[PDB]
């Protein structure tokens, strides 16, 4: 339940 | 009749030159120290013997029988940053969502608050400045938003630069292309219900190119509520429509990859809850909308041509109505000049072909964190970026009256609009050439 | 003989400086409020004590025994948009087809009408401005055209920028290449039978670079009928000809992918019903064609260097023939100056290699909706785009006569050609330096 | 000695400014018409009446 | 010797006429209001601007 | 019978 | 025997 707020996929 | 005498040297006649300059090796050592190139002392003496200070005793005497005046040209050179604290371009208040909660059994409790984000001095270019702003909105969400409910889906306030309305079809009620046409037209600010931004204490407003049609009424607040008519329309469900070939069409894409909601007002409407300034301006009611009290203007990174005033308290007579004082922030003024900063313009068709490549170039999608959401996406870079650029200014003030007894040490002072030394001056110096004007 | 007195301060002689400036913290608060940087009040006093207004009581007195005058240099800075409503660059009338119908058994009823399309303020660059126009023609078709018959095939009026005639073969009567050579030469406007455009109330004309050879005859209307000689020739059926190797050749491609008709005048002629201005100008009868009464000119995005007039009603004497009044829109003028806007020029060989890439860069073919039709296609971007750019103007008017009693509060006013404040002024301020001229 | 008089208005002294300009709404209508910005007439008057 | 000067207009000599009149459209609006034709203000100026 | 007036193919 | 004077091949 932690949003890194970063699209690691792409 | 018109002499010009000094201690014990041959008298000179008709004119000559006294030089006001900071550099001098001697005086820097002694005199100024705790000063800077905007408030310093300097010896006008220029005679190799004599200890500065002891120089201060001597005086250049312009014949007493006549009222003298001197031409004053100066060389000013700064290097002030596009975005800095002193000029008021590193801060800006905006209202964002703080908490999203499940309350008292059935209520959805939304709590919004105003907060002032700051930027890291320097970072020129307009586009990038926008980005740094958007990023600051985020950086805050990272410290408060998420950890209090509020999803990304409902991030209030984002500065973009496109015309969410190019695709738009007057019948469909949707942006047919399924994508908000990714080209940059002008900066604008988008808001979600309940939030908004305030520039009351910031020149960044001028950077976005949005000004009040009535400037002097201190108070630049642009609420969501203000952006009436002109909520970003919604996207056609390009996939559904096509595959479906009735026709789905009415289907207005509700989310996106990684499923973020485009906050649509209702299960029916083609409009989203996202309101855009740029839209309200030219797409909303001209008589009551925002176009009524704000003006769409050319960007300009400098944030606003400001002027600086010179003062040579100990060498020129005090202009008409100024009164002589010793309060650095009230010295008489003898010359005004625009603060040395220009807007150089370039062409980067590489923009958005570059945002596309820039993202791989920069090892991170730091600014584009939401590469799917057609809104929260990273605004397109506009072709033609602007950049504040510092330039030496060989200005020229007119002949000004002089005192018939010029002190050995003169005080030079460059002030700004609000009357305060300006830290960003690297070189200031002037040349004065006295000459007769009439007699007593 | 030549004093300069103020309330109770030492008298000054020969000259000095009065400053006209908007910024002052005090006056902004009180005085101006409902005003803007183009019509404001300001105290010339500059004395820290005294409440503005109470300042208004005081006066700067230039010795009575002599007629004074003052040098007036000013610093003007705007930020007006390439395309906006006030300058008349956001609208433009054109006549398009409204309805295509099947009537009274065998008749084809075509109904055309004039309509005024508007543009979204700001959007600089010439090319893009063209696009925004073409788009507005479309946006209209979307709200009326289709839903009343009229196909895309018969869309009247489209601004392009190429020489539909480069391929042309004097024998074939066709553009051999099978494609209208995709390079940009100059903007021009293409028309279908029965329609046309009107700029009578718009400076955009000047943006396209098409002017009347007799300017003062108010009335810029360019009908289809006018574009005599010079209808875009047709394309060779490149496919037929080649595969066929008599020789097909005479075959003038009648449609295209997605089957749109190139409205050819008859089953015979090599010419299409599409008429191009650019053609008529240099390819049509020089004595009676359009080249007879219109002129091919350099674009210029600013739309036309316009001038602004200054006025300091309460401080300068009224120039020769102006009469003193209190009607803001008739104040006497004391200085004229071109409105601070230049045409910066750039190079983007990236154009059309970019339109090609720009289309993928922008997630939509919003401007290129008809990527097949050699006509309705998206005009080529020209190398060398122009962009209106705002620049501070350190102008200098001459010495002007002064009143021997200068009021505490002076009124400054910058007007435009038609005499009306100009909303786009961000900074205006001037420096006056009085000095003797003769005696009474 | 060095006046500058006009019809019936206060005399002015030492200097002033006469403006040559094409734009004027009135004159364009009447005067120039068959002319262009390179050969035109213009009133130097600048007095709203008349 | 016997001039008659006004703001910035040609000086006039020997005589002329100042008119005291209630009717004026401008002043009625502003000035008098709570007054009547027996106690009123009026501008003697007569200059359309201002 | 609705023209979206947009080449979705390409 | 007609020269289009145009390299259609390329």
Swiss-Prot record, chains B, C:
It holds the Pfam family Adeno_Penton_B. Coiled coil: none annotated. InterPro entries: Adeno_Penton_B (IPR002605). One of its GO terms (biological process) is virion attachment to host cell. GO terms for cellular component: host cell nucleus; T=25 icosahedral viral capsid. It comes from the Viruses. It is found in: Virion; Host nucleus. Keywords: Capsid protein, Clathrin-mediated endocytosis of virus by host, Host nucleus, Host-virus interaction, Late protein, Phosphoprotein, T=25 icosahedral capsid protein, Viral attachment to host cell, Viral penetration into host cytoplasm, Virion, Virus endocytosis by host, Virus entry into host cell. Its main location: virion. The modification Phosphoserine is found at residue 326. All late proteins expressed from the major late promoter are produced by alternative splicing and alternative polyadenylation of the same gene giving rise to non-overlapping ORFs. A leader sequence is present in the N-terminus of all these mRNAs and is recognized by the viral shutoff protein to provide expression although conventional translation via ribosome scanning from the cap has been shut off in the host cell. Belongs to the adenoviridae penton family. The cell attachment RGD motif is exposed at the virion surface and is involved in binding to the integrin heterodimer ITGAV-ITGB5. This is Penton protein. It comes from Human adenovirus C serotype 2 (HAdV-2). The gene is L2.
Curated annotation (Swiss-Prot), chains D, E:
It is found in: Virion; Host nucleus. Induction: Expressed in the late phase of the viral replicative cycle. The cell attachment RGD motif is exposed at the virion surface and is involved in binding to the integrin heterodimer ITGAV-ITGB5. Major capsid protein that self-associates to form penton base pentamers, each in the shape of a pentagon, situated at the 12 vertices of the pseudo T=25 capsid. Involved in virus secondary attachment to host cell after initial attachment by the fiber protein. Binds host integrin heterodimer ITGAV-ITGB5 (alphaV-beta5) thereby triggering clathrin-mediated endocytosis of virions. Mediates initial virus attachment to CXADR-negative cells. Binding to integrins ITGAV-ITGB5 also seems to induce macropinocytosis uptake of the virus. Interacts with the fiber protein (via N-terminal tail region). Interacts with the capsid vertex protein; this interaction binds the penton base to neighboring peripentonal hexons. Interacts (via the cell attachment site RGD) with host heterodimer ITGAV-ITGB5; this interaction promotes virus internalization. Interacts with host WWP1 and WWP2. Belongs to the adenoviridae penton family. All late proteins expressed from the major late promoter are produced by alternative splicing and alternative polyadenylation of the same gene giving rise to non-overlapping ORFs. A leader sequence is present in the N-terminus of all these mRNAs and is recognized by the viral shutoff protein to provide expression although conventional translation via ribosome scanning from the cap has been shut off in the host cell. This is Penton protein. It comes from Human adenovirus C serotype 2 (HAdV-2). The chain holds residues 52 to 101 of 571 of the full protein.
